[PDB]
């Protein structure tokens, strides 16, 4: 059957002219109760791809197993059958898709929502979305969970089409993910102040900045109004 | 006939029953003086108590109808109490349905309208 048990928040992400950034907060909540903090939801597969997994934490672990098995299969046989048949993001993406789809038909699915973000070996930016249902779509900016229809609006104003990718840089995206995270921590009850951030660059590789706190926060407007409306 | 015994109009067009009401508020012999300051309003009133056996503290004519609005009464104390009770009820009600306490202007107008109804009946 399967339904929400212990559930993560949102993975948010965007492209720029030389790569993509992808970030998520560290939470496995048991609904309102925030029962686990410090549980990382970005999972790197090789150094050209980070997969950000949302939804249920249980299923996440069990895809942690499948990504790790995958690296093993690729390494198998020749050592040269993984140097120029090395993994692309597009492979990881498709594999994850088809298992989810067929598991939904057995009626006990992997309850996840996933972003596969990476860069190809030709240098192309790769950001594409899959979910338990098996719906596939690409977008220049993508997010999952609550932040797919909350955080994502802001992000899409930076990049709305494929033409606005050359108008965005690694330091523009950098500011906007920090900002979309602050929006997330503010207006979502499921959130952690902690967040980890990975950047996949094609020029400089995987740079994995972990365990940032939300900064530039404001609460200076909470002294000015008290009561629920009627009370002055 | 009954043009002075109930609140119906007379050939004069003047309601005698109503006139009698004003001829009973000056028979308690209480004077009041009310002045507007520059930041306040002050009202002083008589409180003549001629008895040893009446407690003078409980003899009063200034009733607080709101926490901000006082009311000073010249005339009989049964009718004073009834008008105070009604006014307090309305002032509370105004807070409840309009989200702020009843103004002095409108509290005056509300008792004014009830007085007309009491001389309509």
Swiss-Prot record, chain A:
It is found in: Cytoplasm; Nucleus. It comes from the Eukaryota. Its main location: cytoplasm. GO terms for biological process: proteasomal ubiquitin-independent protein catabolic process; proteasome assembly; proteasome-mediated ubiquitin-dependent protein catabolic process. SUPFAM superfamilies: N-terminal nucleophile aminohydrolases (Ntn hydrolases). Pfam families: Proteasome. One of its GO terms (cellular component) is proteasome core complex, beta-subunit complex. PROSITE patterns: PROTEASOME_BETA_1, PROTEASOME_BETA_2. InterPro entries: Ntn_hydrolases_N, Proteasome_beta4, Proteasome_bsu_CS, Proteasome_sua/b, Proteasome_suB-type. Present with 16900 molecules/cell in log phase SD medium. Non-catalytic component of the proteasome which degrades poly-ubiquitinated proteins in the cytoplasm and in the nucleus. It is essential for the regulated turnover of proteins and for the removal of misfolded proteins. The proteasome is a multicatalytic proteinase complex that is characterized by its ability to cleave peptides with Arg, Phe, Tyr, Leu, and Glu adjacent to the leaving group at neutral or slightly basic pH. It has an ATP-dependent proteolytic activity. PRE3 and PRE4 are necessary for the peptidyl-glutamyl-peptide-hydrolyzing activity. The 26S proteasome consists of a 20S proteasome core and two 19S regulatory subunits. The 20S proteasome core is composed of 28 subunits that are arranged in four stacked rings, resulting in a barrel-shaped structure. The two end rings are each formed by seven alpha subunits, and the two central rings are each formed by seven beta subunits. The catalytic chamber with the active sites is on the inside of the barrel. Interacts with CIC1. This is Proteasome subunit beta type-7. It comes from Saccharomyces cerevisiae (strain ATCC 204508 / S288c) (Baker's yeast).
Swiss-Prot record, chain B:
It is found in: Cytoplasm; Nucleus. It comes from the Eukaryota. The proteasome degrades poly-ubiquitinated proteins in the cytoplasm and in the nucleus. It is essential for the regulated turnover of proteins and for the removal of misfolded proteins. The proteasome is a multicatalytic proteinase complex that is characterized by its ability to cleave peptides with Arg, Phe, Tyr, Leu, and Glu adjacent to the leaving group at neutral or slightly basic pH. It has an ATP-dependent proteolytic activity. Belongs to the peptidase T1A family. The 26S proteasome consists of a 20S proteasome core and two 19S regulatory subunits. The 20S proteasome core is composed of 28 subunits that are arranged in four stacked rings, resulting in a barrel-shaped structure. The two end rings are each formed by seven alpha subunits, and the two central rings are each formed by seven beta subunits. The catalytic chamber with the active sites is on the inside of the barrel. Interacts with CIC1. Present with 15200 molecules/cell in log phase SD medium. This is Proteasome subunit alpha type-1. It comes from Saccharomyces cerevisiae (strain ATCC 204508 / S288c). The lineage of its organism: Eukaryota, Fungi, Dikarya, Ascomycota, Saccharomycotina. The chain holds residues 11 to 131 of 252 of the full protein.
């Amino acid at each position: 059957t399967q339904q929400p048990i212990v559930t993560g928040t949102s993975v948010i992400s965007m492209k720029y002219d030389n790569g993509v950034i992808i970030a998520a907060d560290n939470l496995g909540s048991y609904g309102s109760l925030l029962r686990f903090n410090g549980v990382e939801r970005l999972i790197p597969v090789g150094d050209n791809t980070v997969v950000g997994i949302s939804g249920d934490i249980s299923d996440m672990q069990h895809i942690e197993r499948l990504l790790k098995d995958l690296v093993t299969e690729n390494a198998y046989d020749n050592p040269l059958a993984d140097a120029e048949e090395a993994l692309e993001p597009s492979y990881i993406f498709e594999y994850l898709a088809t298992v989810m789809y067929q598991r939904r038909s057995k009626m006990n699915p992997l309850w996840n929502a996933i972003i596969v973000a990476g860069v190809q070996s030709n240098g192309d930016q790769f950001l594409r979305y899959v979910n338990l249902l098996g719906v596939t779509y690409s977008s220049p900016t993508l997010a999952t969970g609550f932040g797919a229809h909350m955080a994502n609006p802001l992000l899409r104003k930076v990049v709305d089409r494929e033409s606005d990718i050359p108008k965005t840089t690694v330091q523009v995206a950098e500011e906007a993910i920090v900002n979309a995270m602050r929006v997330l921590y503010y207006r979502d009850a499921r959130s952690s102040r902690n967040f980890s951030l990975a950047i996949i660059d094609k020029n400089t590789g995987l740079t994995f900045k972990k365990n940032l706190q939300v900064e530039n926060m404001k609460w200076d407007f909470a002294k000015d109004i008290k009561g629920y409306g009627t009370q002055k | 006939g009954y043009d002075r015994h109930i609140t119906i109009f007379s050939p004069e067009g003047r309601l005698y029953q109503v006139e009698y009401a004003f001829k009973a508020t000056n028979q308690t012999n209480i004077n009041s003086l009310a002045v507007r300051g520059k930041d306040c309003t002050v009202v002083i009133s008589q409180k003549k108590v001629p008895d040893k056996l009446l407690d003078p503290t409980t003899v009063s004519y200034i009733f607080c109808i709101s926490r901000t609005i006082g009311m000073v009464v010249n005339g009989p104390i049964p009718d004073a109490r009834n008008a105070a009770l009604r006014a307090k009820a309305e002032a509370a009600e105004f807070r409840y349905k309009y989200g702020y306490d009843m103004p002095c202007d409108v509290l005056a107008k509300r008792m004014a309208n009830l007085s007309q109804i009491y001389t309509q009946r």
